[PDB]
Amino acid sequence: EAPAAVVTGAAKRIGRAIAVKLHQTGYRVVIHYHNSAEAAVSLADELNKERSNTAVVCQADLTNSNVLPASCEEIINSCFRAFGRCDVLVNNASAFYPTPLVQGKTVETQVAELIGTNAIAPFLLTMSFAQRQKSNLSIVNLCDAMVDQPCMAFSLYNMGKHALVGLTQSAALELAPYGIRVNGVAPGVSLLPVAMGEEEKDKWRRKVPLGRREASAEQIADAVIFLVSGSAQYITGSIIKVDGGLSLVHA
Amino acid sequence: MEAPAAVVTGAAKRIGRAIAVKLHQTGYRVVIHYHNSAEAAVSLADELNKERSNTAVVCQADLTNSNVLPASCEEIINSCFRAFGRCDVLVNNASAFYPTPLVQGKTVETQVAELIGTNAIAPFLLTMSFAQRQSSNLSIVNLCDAMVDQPCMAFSLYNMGKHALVGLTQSAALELAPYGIRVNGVAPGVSLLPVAMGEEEKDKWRRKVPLGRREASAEQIADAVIFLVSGSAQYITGSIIKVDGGLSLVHA
Amino acid sequence: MEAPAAVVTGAAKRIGRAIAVKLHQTGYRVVIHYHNSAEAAVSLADELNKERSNTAVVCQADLTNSNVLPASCEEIINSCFRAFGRCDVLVNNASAFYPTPLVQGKTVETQVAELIGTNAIAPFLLTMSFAQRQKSSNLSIVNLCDAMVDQPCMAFSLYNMGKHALVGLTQSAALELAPYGIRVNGVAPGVSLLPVAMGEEEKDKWRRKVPLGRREASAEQIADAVIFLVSGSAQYITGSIIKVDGGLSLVHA
Amino acid sequence: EAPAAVVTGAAKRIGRAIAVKLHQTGYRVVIHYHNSAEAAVSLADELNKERSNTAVVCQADLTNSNVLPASCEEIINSCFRAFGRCDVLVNNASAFYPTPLVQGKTVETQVAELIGTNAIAPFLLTMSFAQRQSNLSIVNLCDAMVDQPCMAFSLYNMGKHALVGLTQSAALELAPYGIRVNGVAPGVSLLPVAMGEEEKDKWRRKVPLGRREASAEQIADAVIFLVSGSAQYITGSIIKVDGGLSLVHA
Ligand SMILES: NC(=O)c1ccc[n+]([C@@H]2O[C@H](COP(=O)([O-])OP(=O)(O)OC[C@H]3O[C@@H](n4cnc5c(N)ncnc54)[C@H](OP(=O)(O)O)[C@@H]3O)[C@@H](O)[C@H]2O)c1
Ligand SMILES: NC(=O)c1ccc[n+]([C@@H]2O[C@H](COP(=O)([O-])OP(=O)(O)OC[C@H]3O[C@@H](n4cnc5c(N)ncnc54)[C@H](OP(=O)(O)O)[C@@H]3O)[C@@H](O)[C@H]2O)c1
Ligand SMILES: NC(=O)c1ccc[n+]([C@@H]2O[C@H](COP(=O)([O-])OP(=O)(O)OC[C@H]3O[C@@H](n4cnc5c(N)ncnc54)[C@H](OP(=O)(O)O)[C@@H]3O)[C@@H](O)[C@H]2O)c1
Ligand SMILES: NC(=O)c1ccc[n+]([C@@H]2O[C@H](COP(=O)([O-])OP(=O)(O)OC[C@H]3O[C@@H](n4cnc5c(N)ncnc54)[C@H](OP(=O)(O)O)[C@@H]3O)[C@@H](O)[C@H]2O)c1
Ligand SMILES: Nc1nc2ccc(SC(F)(F)F)cc2s1
Ligand SMILES: Nc1nc2ccc(SC(F)(F)F)cc2s1
Ligand SMILES: Nc1nc2ccc(SC(F)(F)F)cc2s1
Ligand SMILES: Nc1nc2ccc(SC(F)(F)F)cc2s1
């Protein structure tokens, strides 16, 4: 029987490339999405045309609130309802926008989005994933290779991604006895934000030593595929940078 | 109005009390923030005001994450400006610490609001308030944890909160540097052990520490805070000083 | 000449042997570098050449630091171009590992030459020789690092200095060689094959500390991360070190 | 009664500032130098004019070689001969120049100089300090930028990473003897004499806190803290003194 994976924020960009590649490797996939319902259903349709009954969608807002734990329970439950099993969780969904310390949404909305999506939802998904266990079980967290050299005015985003490093280590430690590995993939610059102009995109591109270009979504997905694979069966608590050398470049 | 002034969160007992005492001894006026420890906070302010009149005030606030945390953090900073006319130093010391197992009577969302609210979100909001309200020597010191990469079993949310606080330390150092506000951390290993911890378990930890097989005093933690706020650290920002007796170098 | 070629140092036994086997399985021709283990090196080359003729050679060299180490490292890279007409991958695996207490029959200058030469200087000189030779391709270097260098064994200062220096080489060489398309990465085992000396009970002390399975990594599990880093699946990865340590480095004292 | 300190490469720049501030704190000092004989004797004269019999100079080459161990033993012995004790070792001397991987010193000389001064000599000085043994400690001058290194400085960067390794390993091993071992990691402090003014300003503009390099005295302040009674539970720590430079992305 084919294993099953949940990918959060899988309708577009990097999470889509991860779900496509897990699907190409033989997984059945839950395509989680928040707002991108058309893109989500479309991808599931494509994957189901390739092999029948192998993809479902699941809608959830991963903002922090008193119902986030139930929404995280439901995402995991949807994998067991569809596939009877849940072998892999990829924490990919993320909010990303500036929160300047010196002066739009209220500050507690910014905290709920940037800490909720980037850190607390991964924690609750990890709890739900682990508790539902009755094989090569793992979790991969999408981290950020530049968290020690952050973008100016992104403190809450940075705080959430440092927290996700902490979860990666703490959950690896705690879930090792259950045979669940927990690792991360840390892109530098990959698919640039859609709102970004080409000129600004090129400023970032020119900083990358290996090829002066951003990672493709497939290149990020390749490292996720490695970490879920049997070739990573002794790896837990590791974060693999996939950044073309960007984090080595001084100011 | 010539003496500088400091806010210390969770200043009634243990490490925050030692910090407040040592800043006061260095010549600071101090705000002693407390949540539940009113009697101890006031007892410390009485002690400091006897030494030097009108140099210590108390400020009550809960630092749990909520819709009101922003107002509570604004009020802590405001209380320093009201009392003393200025606020030179913020010490983010208050902290919740307890296990949160992944495989399982506070709701999980309450555990979040305390372990992430109190240890990371409150420092972030206090930082925004402190910065907004600004030969000055302005700085923030965050109480971090030297064992963040080799954490205690079943302490995920606490670990998450202390990693978030490293992220705040670095991001705020970068962004506030133009304002001349330095932002640094002090990372204890084992210092005063939790009051709830058993004696045998305390000794198990002390035996691990390379440097003298004992925990740090609160005053040893405070000494690193005093260095970082001083004129001898005026080029230091974004730095976290471990004060752990070598504990974090010891393999399993 | 369509098959790529790889140099693996210290490849006669244990982890380097497993790396040379997996690279060969992947379609690489291999130079099996050895120092003292000639019989084991030759035996591996004969096994590999039985599988596919003319795909494995051995190369003997001492990688201790000295006046002649630069010429030795140049000769190891040259051996790969003479055997196979190309050198696509260098794996810096050879290593000396023994205690060097700070407080009290090798002299300390011999200890320095062996521990810093094998773990750090020889990798640097091999890296220089590999790059100088390179002026469809997927050129990369993988350095065998150590996941425990921040929580080191007592009295191993020179060993730990050499492995920290190797992290620095991995980063500096990644940045400097990225314009030539040469990626430079590391694999950091925690406990893998335990040193031949140790008795089952002492091996068992270390095994019991590993969260993931309470056992050491096989040599092949370490090799698997090397295979990933040299592969087309890692073509944007440079300057990275992959721990393969079962969670050991997360475990407090 | 006054404690004594060895500072390597103490004739000029940051090591000089460290020697001065230790002396101002009450220490007797060995001013180690290699080539800067006039500047070393001149500083010793200035310190002894302030307090007689409190400064000596000691000449040694800290390039790696089969005689480096004897030179490092001699530097520690010079402190005991002058002052009868040695409480503090500051590993400050350092070669710094590029060593490109792709192409008038031989590569074997560049390895001996950059790995010997930045790493091997500190190790042997540590061994000699420990063996010859109050608030004993060693401070290693590290580099805040070693994970974001200058292009073509691989051997320098290898030496400074090795010095982090030594700081940790010796802190662990010497803790039972009460010897603390810590580091201070400048970002940009006093820029190299040979560097042109235009390049100096390029580096200054990158520093978030003040858009200026650290003074030698600001670096020495962090050394004074780590040797002080206010750092008695600190060992294996490296303090960055870099004005935020290491936080700044490309
Ligand atoms: N892209 C890069 O250069 C880069 C660099 C470093 C790290 N990363 C990390 O790599 C991962 C993938 O990057 P990306 O560029 O593909 O991410 P992205 O496009 O910014 O976000 C991916 C998805 O996250 C989901 N999301 C956002 N807010 C949400 C909420 N409140 N609830 C539920 N879902 C939410 C969205 O789903 P809907 O569209 O369905 O609403 C969005 O499409 C992220 O974790 C990111 O931080 C990326
Ligand atoms: N003790 C150690 O060995 C050690 C080790 C590593 C790191 N640290 C760090 O060092 C710092 C000080 O440690 P410590 O042992 O002195 O801390 P602690 O005793 O656990 O807590 C300090 C104070 O924090 C306040 N606090 C807790 N929850 C709060 C909430 N919801 N709102 C407002 N205040 C709250 C409490 O004040 P009230 O009493 O007024 O309610 C408490 O007295 C902490 O940040 C800690 O994580 C300590
Ligand atoms: N095994 C582990 O648990 C572990 C843990 C952490 C890191 N690592 C790292 O992973 C790599 C492989 O580990 P391993 O256990 O397989 O290594 P190993 O057996 O200790 O050493 C590998 C080979 O290194 C060669 N070597 C030693 N000194 C040499 C010199 N002076 N000149 C030339 N070659 C020399 C020897 O070759 P000859 O036999 O031909 O003389 C030896 O067989 C090493 O870099 C090690 O530091 C291993
Ligand atoms: N300046 C900065 O911006 C900066 C930045 C990062 C880290 N650091 C570190 O901080 C420390 C002090 O910096 P600095 O700029 O003051 O250093 P420096 O001026 O470059 O060097 C200090 C002294 O080291 C001695 N030295 C060099 N080669 C030697 C050899 N073969 N044998 C013995 N001594 C030798 C020289 O002594 P003589 O003059 O007597 O020959 C030299 O004056 C160094 O460890 C450096 O790596 C400095
Ligand atoms: N959720 C998301 N996180 C990031 C982080 C960095 C980047 S690349 C950039 F914008 F240059 F920093 C894009 C995204 S989208
Ligand atoms: N708020 C607090 N945080 C910590 C972290 C560690 C410790 S020492 C211990 F408990 F051994 F890990 C005590 C406290 S109290
Ligand atoms: N060359 C070598 N390096 C190491 C490092 C660790 C280990 S595992 C051990 F010994 F438990 F630390 C074996 C070796 S063999
Ligand atoms: N021995 C020495 N090491 C360094 C490291 C950096 C610097 S600052 C510079 F050069 F901008 F990198 C000067 C020196 S002098």
XYZ file of N, CA, C and O in Angstrom, chain A residues 168-170 172-173 175-177 179-181 188-190 208-216 219-220 222-223 226-227 230-246 248-249, chain C residues 170-172 174-175 177-179 181-183 190-192 210-218 221-222 224-225 228 232-248 250-252:
384
model
N 11.755 21.876 15.573
C 12.472 20.823 14.799
C 13.367 19.995 15.740
O 13.306 18.735 15.757
N 14.197 20.678 16.561
C 15.097 20.014 17.485
C 14.347 19.323 18.620
O 14.631 18.150 18.951
N 13.436 20.069 19.286
C 12.697 19.491 20.423
C 11.838 18.287 19.979
O 11.785 17.273 20.684
N 12.364 16.375 17.253
C 13.262 15.259 16.895
C 13.639 14.486 18.153
O 13.628 13.244 18.162
N 14.029 15.193 19.211
C 14.446 14.584 20.423
C 13.311 13.705 20.992
O 13.555 12.550 21.401
N 10.348 12.659 19.636
C 9.639 11.670 18.793
C 10.579 10.573 18.299
O 10.094 9.612 17.695
N 11.880 10.697 18.565
C 12.818 9.635 18.124
C 12.374 8.260 18.677
O 12.419 7.285 17.935
N 11.954 8.182 19.966
C 11.547 6.865 20.523
C 10.369 6.207 19.777
O 10.264 4.997 19.844
N 10.129 6.466 16.426
C 10.542 6.244 15.080
C 10.090 7.327 14.129
O 10.072 7.105 12.949
N 9.756 8.515 14.647
C 9.377 9.623 13.794
C 10.603 10.544 13.727
O 10.956 11.128 14.754
N 11.104 10.708 12.531
C 12.222 11.718 12.334
C 11.628 13.108 12.098
O 10.540 13.266 11.497
N 17.252 29.708 0.838
C 17.706 31.091 0.914
C 16.710 31.962 0.160
O 15.704 32.443 0.733
N 17.037 32.253 -1.088
C 16.006 32.836 -1.956
C 15.582 31.773 -2.967
O 16.402 31.132 -3.608
N 14.281 31.551 -3.017
C 13.734 30.617 -3.972
C 12.752 31.471 -4.759
O 13.115 32.627 -5.104
N 23.580 35.691 -4.925
C 23.715 34.202 -4.731
C 24.997 33.739 -5.428
O 25.119 33.762 -6.686
N 25.988 33.239 -4.671
C 27.208 32.772 -5.298
C 27.000 31.680 -6.361
O 27.670 31.749 -7.382
N 26.149 30.674 -6.105
C 26.070 29.513 -6.989
C 25.023 29.848 -8.087
O 23.826 29.537 -7.938
N 25.481 30.533 -9.144
C 24.623 30.740 -10.320
C 23.901 32.082 -10.351
O 23.217 32.366 -11.363
N 23.999 32.915 -9.297
C 23.351 34.269 -9.292
C 21.881 34.148 -9.681
O 21.385 34.963 -10.490
N 21.197 33.168 -9.122
C 19.777 32.963 -9.385
C 19.169 32.286 -8.159
O 19.904 31.672 -7.329
N 17.864 32.408 -8.025
C 17.110 31.832 -6.926
C 16.947 30.335 -7.156
O 17.063 29.870 -8.299
N 16.710 29.584 -6.066
C 16.346 28.169 -6.171
C 15.021 28.045 -6.926
O 14.081 28.797 -6.646
N 14.966 27.021 -7.772
C 13.645 26.552 -8.296
C 12.867 25.868 -7.171
O 13.410 25.361 -6.198
N 14.023 22.291 -6.766
C 15.325 22.112 -6.030
C 15.039 22.043 -4.522
O 15.633 21.240 -3.755
N 14.133 22.922 -4.054
C 13.716 22.824 -2.643
C 13.052 21.472 -2.422
O 13.275 20.752 -1.404
N 13.462 18.689 -3.882
C 14.435 17.554 -3.916
C 14.985 17.293 -2.519
O 15.228 16.141 -2.117
N 15.206 18.379 -1.740
C 15.803 18.140 -0.402
C 14.745 17.552 0.541
O 15.054 16.740 1.433
N 14.623 13.845 -0.294
C 15.731 13.146 0.380
C 15.409 12.821 1.849
O 15.581 11.695 2.348
N 14.962 13.843 2.622
C 14.794 13.682 4.032
C 13.643 12.710 4.355
O 13.683 12.062 5.380
N 14.364 6.622 2.321
C 15.102 5.639 3.160
C 16.592 5.983 3.166
O 17.348 5.508 3.983
N 16.991 6.900 2.304
C 18.433 7.336 2.320
C 18.711 8.316 3.468
O 19.883 8.749 3.622
N 17.659 8.724 4.210
C 17.846 9.643 5.384
C 17.387 8.998 6.687
O 17.062 9.692 7.678
N 17.400 7.670 6.751
C 16.790 6.974 7.865
C 17.531 7.153 9.201
O 16.954 6.892 10.235
N 18.771 7.654 9.226
C 19.428 7.952 10.507
C 19.432 9.494 10.768
O 19.988 9.920 11.768
N 18.817 10.294 9.899
C 18.861 11.761 10.028
C 17.616 12.231 10.800
O 16.500 12.040 10.344
N 17.844 12.890 11.928
C 16.740 13.534 12.685
C 17.347 14.746 13.396
O 18.497 14.695 13.858
N 16.571 15.813 13.461
C 17.042 17.054 14.057
C 17.966 17.844 13.139
O 18.616 18.815 13.632
N 18.096 17.468 11.878
C 18.966 18.224 10.905
C 18.172 19.227 10.078
O 17.056 18.911 9.650
N 18.791 20.399 9.821
C 18.222 21.345 8.926
C 19.163 21.501 7.746
O 20.321 21.886 7.933
N 18.693 21.137 6.565
C 19.537 21.242 5.338
C 19.295 22.596 4.668
O 18.189 22.856 4.211
N 20.331 23.444 4.625
C 20.274 24.677 3.848
C 20.245 24.291 2.374
O 20.938 23.375 1.924
N 19.412 25.005 1.642
C 19.372 24.901 0.184
C 19.368 26.337 -0.333
O 18.337 26.844 -0.707
N 20.538 26.967 -0.352
C 20.648 28.416 -0.531
C 21.729 28.917 -1.487
O 21.922 30.162 -1.612
N 22.354 28.027 -2.286
C 23.335 28.462 -3.283
C 24.475 29.255 -2.672
O 25.146 29.985 -3.353
N 24.725 29.086 -1.336
C 25.772 29.842 -0.704
C 25.354 31.215 -0.162
O 26.227 31.945 0.363
N 24.066 31.622 -0.280
C 23.693 33.023 0.044
C 24.072 33.410 1.494
O 24.582 34.529 1.738
N 26.450 32.553 3.235
C 27.913 32.724 3.483
C 28.403 34.113 3.080
O 29.594 34.415 3.271
N 27.539 34.917 2.434
C 27.998 36.160 1.802
C 27.895 37.298 2.824
O 26.774 37.649 3.281
N 34.973 24.210 4.420
C 33.737 23.900 3.687
C 33.046 25.217 3.296
O 32.642 25.404 2.114
N 32.890 26.125 4.262
C 32.249 27.428 3.978
C 33.104 28.293 3.045
O 32.540 28.827 2.069
N 34.395 28.470 3.362
C 35.234 29.388 2.546
C 35.349 28.861 1.116
O 35.277 29.637 0.153
N 33.247 26.821 -0.427
C 31.932 26.944 -1.128
C 31.820 28.348 -1.763
O 31.365 28.481 -2.903
N 32.119 29.371 -0.981
C 31.954 30.740 -1.478
C 32.894 31.012 -2.674
O 32.477 31.600 -3.717
N 34.579 28.828 -4.678
C 34.502 27.956 -5.867
C 33.125 28.000 -6.557
O 32.982 27.398 -7.624
N 32.104 28.611 -5.945
C 30.772 28.685 -6.553
C 30.869 29.294 -7.974
O 30.177 28.835 -8.866
N 31.767 30.284 -8.230
C 31.831 30.757 -9.668
C 32.277 29.730 -10.723
O 31.904 29.839 -11.906
N 31.291 26.675 -10.520
C 30.306 25.598 -10.546
C 30.682 24.415 -9.647
O 30.114 23.314 -9.793
N 31.617 24.619 -8.709
C 32.034 23.521 -7.807
C 31.289 23.777 -6.500
O 31.548 24.799 -5.845
N 30.432 22.827 -6.133
C 29.763 22.910 -4.824
C 30.648 22.241 -3.726
O 31.440 21.347 -4.004
N 27.498 11.522 13.866
C 27.666 11.632 15.328
C 28.458 10.417 15.802
O 29.699 10.458 15.887
N 27.766 9.299 16.045
C 28.506 8.033 16.196
C 28.080 7.116 15.053
O 26.895 6.902 14.780
N 29.094 6.699 14.288
C 28.906 5.732 13.243
C 29.741 4.516 13.657
O 29.781 4.168 14.821
N 21.979 7.497 21.720
C 21.401 7.929 20.456
C 19.876 7.834 20.531
O 19.321 6.725 20.627
N 19.180 8.965 20.447
C 17.688 8.886 20.505
C 17.079 7.994 19.418
O 16.104 7.247 19.681
N 17.550 8.100 18.187
C 16.900 7.446 17.088
C 17.461 6.023 16.968
O 18.415 5.791 16.217
N 16.876 5.110 17.761
C 17.166 3.671 17.593
C 18.219 3.140 18.558
O 18.494 1.935 18.527
N 18.826 3.996 19.403
C 19.870 3.623 20.323
C 20.912 2.730 19.626
O 21.273 1.669 20.123
N 21.397 3.155 18.468
C 22.460 2.423 17.743
C 23.275 3.476 16.958
O 22.777 4.611 16.724
N 24.513 3.102 16.611
C 25.398 3.932 15.750
C 24.920 3.910 14.293
O 24.261 2.951 13.876
N 25.293 4.912 13.446
C 24.977 4.853 12.041
C 25.856 3.793 11.387
O 27.042 3.600 11.775
N 25.245 3.098 10.447
C 26.074 2.243 9.576
C 26.971 3.131 8.712
O 26.623 4.274 8.466
N 24.811 4.401 5.875
C 23.890 5.525 6.156
C 24.674 6.852 6.012
O 24.173 7.811 5.427
N 25.924 6.800 6.407
C 26.759 8.036 6.215
C 26.945 8.221 4.711
O 26.781 9.348 4.146
N 25.045 7.356 2.358
C 23.871 7.812 1.632
C 23.808 9.387 1.542
O 23.300 9.933 0.555
N 24.228 10.086 2.607
C 24.165 11.544 2.597
C 25.228 12.053 1.633
O 25.025 13.107 1.002
N 23.686 11.781 -1.817
C 22.726 12.860 -2.047
C 23.467 14.146 -2.436
O 23.115 14.849 -3.435
N 22.536 15.188 -8.706
C 21.684 16.202 -9.363
C 20.567 16.757 -8.462
O 20.107 17.886 -8.681
N 20.183 16.031 -7.419
C 19.132 16.459 -6.436
C 19.650 17.512 -5.449
O 18.888 17.964 -4.591
N 20.961 17.796 -5.497
C 21.552 18.760 -4.557
C 22.248 19.871 -5.323
O 23.148 20.522 -4.772
N 21.799 20.175 -6.558
C 22.578 21.083 -7.405
C 22.509 22.555 -6.944
O 23.279 23.373 -7.443
N 21.651 22.910 -5.997
C 21.624 24.309 -5.487
C 22.263 24.343 -4.089
O 22.248 25.428 -3.450
N 22.733 23.182 -3.604
C 23.233 23.066 -2.171
C 24.753 23.289 -2.193
O 25.485 22.538 -2.841
N 25.217 24.375 -1.549
C 26.687 24.529 -1.346
C 26.892 25.217 0.014
O 26.034 26.048 0.469
N 27.991 24.861 0.681
C 28.261 25.448 1.997
C 27.405 24.817 3.098
O 27.301 25.387 4.205
N 26.784 23.687 2.846
C 25.882 23.094 3.832
C 26.554 21.899 4.483
O 27.239 21.122 3.751
N 26.275 21.697 5.788
C 26.752 20.460 6.448
C 25.552 19.692 6.993
O 24.815 20.195 7.853
N 25.355 18.486 6.471
C 24.211 17.588 6.884
C 24.645 16.690 8.050
O 25.532 15.857 7.904
N 24.064 16.922 9.231
C 24.288 16.026 10.353
C 23.594 14.700 10.019
O 22.473 14.665 9.504
N 24.268 13.623 10.343
C 23.658 12.245 10.208
C 24.002 11.603 11.530
O 24.957 10.822 11.640
N 23.250 11.993 12.576
C 23.638 11.608 13.922
C 22.515 11.042 14.853
O 22.790 10.788 16.045
N 21.380 10.741 14.255
C 20.287 10.031 15.050
C 19.770 10.899 16.195
O 19.222 10.367 17.156
N 20.047 12.210 16.139
C 19.657 13.102 17.250
C 20.670 13.213 18.388
O 20.431 13.943 19.350
N 21.858 12.598 18.276
C 22.796 12.560 19.375
C 23.184 13.968 19.868
O 23.313 14.171 21.091
N 21.542 16.648 19.942
C 20.416 17.322 20.670
C 20.341 16.922 22.154
O 19.542 17.528 22.912
N 21.164 15.963 22.595
C 20.981 15.307 23.924
C 21.872 16.023 24.954
O 23.131 16.052 24.832
N 21.243 16.605 25.986
C 21.983 17.343 26.987
C 22.742 16.386 27.919
O 22.442 15.171 27.948
